[PDB]
């Protein structure tokens, strides 16, 4: 599956 | 693949 | 992997 989302900018 | 931008 | 930064 897709990873997950990256941190906030 | 990787994950979508924070 | 995780995504990149907003």
Request: charged share 0%; aromatic share 0%; hydrophobic share 0%.
């Amino acid at each position: 599956p897709p990873g997950p989302p990256g941190p906030p900018g | 693949p990787p994950g979508p931008p924070g």
